[PDB]
Amino acid sequence: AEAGITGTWYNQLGSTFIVTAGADGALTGTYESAVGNAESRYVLTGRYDSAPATDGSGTALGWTVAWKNNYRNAHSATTWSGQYVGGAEARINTQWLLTSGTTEANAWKSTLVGHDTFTKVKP
Amino acid sequence: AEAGITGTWYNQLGSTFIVTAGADGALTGTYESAVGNAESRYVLTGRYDSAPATDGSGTALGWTVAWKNNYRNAHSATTWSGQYVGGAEARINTQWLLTSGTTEANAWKSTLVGHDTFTKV
């Protein structure tokens, strides 16, 4: 449900995800690096299923962050694909892909894969 | 076809993969890296479906290569998961995971993912 996703979340490395779920299936917000002052905020845009199933199934969603802001440009973008599972302890379980811009010759190792779990802290 | 996996395969980067498929599901062979070289060879071991479905489906398989031999140790290992499809133009289509041994602090970025298509040409 949009409300449930909306809010502030943190993952196991200490990064901050602040998101607003809109009625039309859109996701907008900011992603912040693990601790590290204020200028470590990047823009994120995504989409979720605004009409999930009844059942105790999670809500699929995904979002992207290109790691460029006014202070730094890591020439890479990360996409997280996962499910929001509500309850008293809501969580967003994801798998992510981080791709860096490379030359033709290093393209073979341009992408990293991992997984993060987010815990909600504020609405 | 079944032991059609046996042979020498090449991927788009130039690596050569030589494997023997045992009747019971084993995959054994050598994986050689860049230039052809001499000890650019690493051991590989895997498993495949020795009784694949009798419908035009490919044969599921996978194998691993630890990047250490008596000349180099790149402290990493790669696993390829995919399927074999035979015919006039046999191919092995895979997706792989390359994990490097790291310290905790670097564990989050210890794994790369990619895809390779191997042919006998």
Binding site: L13, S33, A34, S40, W67 | A105, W108, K109
Partner: peptide, 8 residues
Amino acid sequence: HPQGPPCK
């Protein structure tokens, strides 16, 4: 990388 933890 901004996606990983704080440095040493």
